[PDB]
Amino acid sequence: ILFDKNKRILKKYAKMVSKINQIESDLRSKKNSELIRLSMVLKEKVNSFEDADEHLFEAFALVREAARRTLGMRPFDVQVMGGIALHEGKVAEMKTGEGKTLAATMPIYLNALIGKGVHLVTVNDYLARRDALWMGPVYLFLGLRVGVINSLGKSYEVVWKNPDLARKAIEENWSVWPDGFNGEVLKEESMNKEAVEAFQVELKEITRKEAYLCDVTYGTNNEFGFDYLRDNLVLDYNDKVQRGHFYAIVDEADSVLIDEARTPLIISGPSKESPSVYRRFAQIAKKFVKDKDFTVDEKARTIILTEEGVAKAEKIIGVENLYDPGNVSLLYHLINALKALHLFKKDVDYVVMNGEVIIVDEFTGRLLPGRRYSGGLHQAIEAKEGVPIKEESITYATITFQNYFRMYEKLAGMTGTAKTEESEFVQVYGMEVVVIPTHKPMIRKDHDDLVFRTQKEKYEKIVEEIEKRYKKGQPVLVGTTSIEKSELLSSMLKKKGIPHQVLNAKYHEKEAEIVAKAGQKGMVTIATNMAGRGTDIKLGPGVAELGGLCIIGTERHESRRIDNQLRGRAGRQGDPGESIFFLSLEDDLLRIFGSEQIGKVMNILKIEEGQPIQHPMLSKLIENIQKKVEGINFSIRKTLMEMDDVLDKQRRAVYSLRDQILLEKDYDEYLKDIFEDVVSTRVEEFCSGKNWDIESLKNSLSFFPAGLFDLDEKQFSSSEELHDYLFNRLWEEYQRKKQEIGEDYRKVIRFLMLRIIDDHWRRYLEEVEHVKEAVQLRSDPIVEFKKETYYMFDEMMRRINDTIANYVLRVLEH
Ligand SMILES: Nc1ncnc2c1ncn2[C@@H]1O[C@H](COP(=O)(O)OP(=O)(O)O)[C@@H](O)[C@H]1O
Numbered sequence: 001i002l003f004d005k006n007k008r009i010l011k012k013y014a015k016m017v018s019k020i021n022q023i024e025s026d027l028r029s030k031k032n033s034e035l036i037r038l039s040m041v042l043k044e045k046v047n048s049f050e051d052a053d054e055h056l057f058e059a060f061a062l063v064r065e066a067a068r069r070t071l072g073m074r075p076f077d078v079q080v081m082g083g084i085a086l087h088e089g090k091v092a093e094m095k096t097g098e099g100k101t102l103a104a105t106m107p108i109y110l111n112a113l114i115g116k117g118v119h120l121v122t123v124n125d126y127l128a129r130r131d132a133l134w135m136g137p138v139y140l141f142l143g144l145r146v147g148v149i150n151s152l153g154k155s156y157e158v159v160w161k162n163p164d165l166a167r168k169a170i171e172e173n174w175s176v177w178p179d180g181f182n183g184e185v186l187k188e189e190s191m192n193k194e195a196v197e198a199f200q201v202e203l204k205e206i207t208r209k210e211a212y213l214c215d216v217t218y219g220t221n222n223e224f225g226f227d228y229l230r231d232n233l234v235l236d237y238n239d240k241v242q243r244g245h246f247y248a249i250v251d252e253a254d255s256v257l258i259d260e261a262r263t264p265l266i267i268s269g270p271s272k273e274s275p276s277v278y279r280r281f282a283q284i285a286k287k288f289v290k291d292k293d294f295t296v297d298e299k300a301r302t303i304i305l306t307e308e309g310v311a312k313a314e315k316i317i318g319v320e321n322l323y324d325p326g327n328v329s330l331l332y333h334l335i336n337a338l339k340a341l342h343l344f345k346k347d348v349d350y351v352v353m354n355g356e357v358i359i360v361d362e363f364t365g366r367l368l369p370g371r372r373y374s375g376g377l378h379q380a381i382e383a384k385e386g387v388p389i390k391e392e393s394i395t396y397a398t399i400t401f402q403n404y405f406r407m408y409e410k411l412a413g414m415t416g417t418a419k420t421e422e423s424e425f426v427q428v429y430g431m432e433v434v435v436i437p438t439h440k441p442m443i444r445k446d447h448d449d450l451v452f453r454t455q456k457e458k459y460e461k462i463v464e465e466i467e468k469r470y471k472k473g474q475p476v477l478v479g480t481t482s483i484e485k486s487e488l489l490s491s492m493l494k495k496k497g498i499p500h501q502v503l504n505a506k507y508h509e510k511e512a513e514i515v516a517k518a519g520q521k522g523m524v525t526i527a528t529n530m531a532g533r534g535t536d537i538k539l540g541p542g543v544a545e546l547g548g549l550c551i552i553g554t555e556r557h558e559s560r561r562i563d564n565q566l567r568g569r570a571g572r573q574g575d576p577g578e579s580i581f582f583l584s585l586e587d588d589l590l591r592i593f594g595s596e597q598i599g600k601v602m603n604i605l606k607i608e609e610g611q612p613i614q615h616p617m618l619s620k621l622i623e624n625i626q627k628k629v630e631g632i633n634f635s636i637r638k639t640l641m642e643m644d645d646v647l648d649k650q651r652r653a654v655y656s657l658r659d660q661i662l663l664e665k666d667y668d669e670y671l672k673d674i675f676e677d678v679v680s681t682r683v684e685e686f687c688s689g690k691n692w693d694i695e696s697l698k699n700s701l702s703f704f705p706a707g708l709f710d711l712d713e714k715q716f717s718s719s720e721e722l723h724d725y726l727f728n729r730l731w732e733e734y735q736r737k738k739q740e741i742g743e744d745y746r747k748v749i750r751f752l753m754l755r756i757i758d759d760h761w762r763r764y765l766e767e768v769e770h771v772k773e774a775v776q777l778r779s780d781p782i783v784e785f786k787k788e789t790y791y792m793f794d795e796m797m798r799r800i801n802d803t804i805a806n807y808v809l810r811v812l813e814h
């Protein structure tokens, strides 16, 4: 960093806004018909990022006009500035209440013209619907289709409430905003009510695919990521719903890209297996005779059913062929139960303390309570031990939000709180942060921090402060970091007789309705973890006079971003307001750094028991403490990211393979490769160089059915002759099965391949998660984790290929 980047950039944005301001005169004279015709022309002229830059001024001024006429809202110059930052793939830092929702319409429109889709990401289903409907008239007016995706499979399109009336309003030159009103903001009285009615919108349901084929798609960070994961769980390539990752704008950018991104996105579902089927197979397993019905490979830790074993299995269960596609779960259950019984031993690999099965960690020799074996093996052991079988979700797929959002050709974000952790946006996502000036002077009184010796006196004083403000009539919004802390404060206020509401960040539409009233005289609101996030809190009558909304932070976070989010809920659009952060020496933050030092100063200065210390220099120290904790946490999380990214490259390889399988008509070439890999790895291992261990080779191939290889009385002239024999037998039997089964064999094979690969990938994820924890607790861990994953991944592929080879030869046999 060799210069003041932010100033440099704004200098350019100011000139651009000036040019956009100049265009306004012209467009404002236009009729709605002409503006739509201009939209059509821009459509034809913009087919790439290069074209968009050429027509940005026109596009931005056009959206501003559409918004004025359909919403009665004219984007302020600073919203236009934020829109440019977004178009340039940066994070626009616009404070709370600056109108980010409307600022994004401009780059969304411009880039949507390219015709490849645009994703507007926000943080919950309520906000995605809200912003799509709120901004909808602008997009529809200009001829764009707007999709919305929500959880539970709900997909919508924004459409006019009355298309005929909307059509009339457009063809006739209607505007919510009357001609000759040259203000920045429209008084409510001045709104043309017929235009407001005409330009109303609503949601109609559409398919998820269609939501992605709209020109802009509104959704949540979860739903966009889930759709990509589900696209890689499909059984037919044509069932994928996304169409690339072209441009995404992430609203609440730090919440999504840093905070929510601390944990991976995971797709899971109910196992739908009765515990009774596990106990049944525990019983079935006991009837199997070792070295007659099966053999145990103690090195590979595997169970292999013999001919007589699968015959016994089929008779007991009872099916015609244990390896038929509909029987995959039954085979799985039998192997699990035999494995639990013969490869897992009580007081060695696990223990049964008090009705529960507990791992004996092989990495430390210590117990890992509550943590479970992969792939339902835990249930099998529980069933083996006759203890309660605990329910499990099935994890189908995973990706980090970092890796999801890095797929986009262009990425942008907007939030009020980004600059303090700009290097995270730069290093992780390649986006710098542009601090956009506020529309109005920011006059919120951000008081110096109060630090108490204990949490007990802190909370007592928090309640005293609330009582004081309530009696004055000045509304208070109190932020906490946990539902626990909220309900404790609520109890204390209830004892003082102070009416109030508690918002716990669970019911987003209802909490939005409630928090919208938080700025009215006498209101007291406790909001857990920014409950009601994104809803504007307007000040009620008489409130500005009392000093506006008073924000109380009941502690400070490890990231000042999150503190700044809370304080930003007051003082919006130049309103008066206040914030106060309360801390104690017993708080999490100060227990990390500073409790001791600050405690010494309090005693030196003879701060009274129950009283706080407060000083600009203390506020600075606290801010510096947060800088330090942020820097350390960022370092640690980046190490975790590096490990996730190793696993992500493997994921991309597996998904790529999966897609090719879905796209393949004929599996001849793939099975040649598989059979080659199955034979060659074993021939090189036992029969290359000096070695000639046909016995081990034979055992290594023992998972295959009898009747495939006869290695006992053959005398091969070379490893090549041996290789060719083994390959040819596999190939001959594959070709025979094509003839016996007919052309549906290909579909069967595709089904088995997908299942085998998905199953191995699911269980591999569960195991590398263990290694991830193991390496990061033996605390560079990147190198060690890399090599360990390689080994496991390599073995996974060995096992996938053997399993496919074996399954395709056994399936549908008579
Ligand atoms: N250009 C504008 N003219 C008039 N009102 C606006 C304008 N832009 C935003 N608003 C209003 O400002 C408030 C905050 O907008 P919002 O998009 O929720 O802000 P943010 O997402 O930046 O917190 C809302 O009440 C919205 O109606």
Ligand SMILES: [Mg+2]
Residues within 6 Å of the ligand: 100, 101, 534
């Ligand atoms: Mg917002």
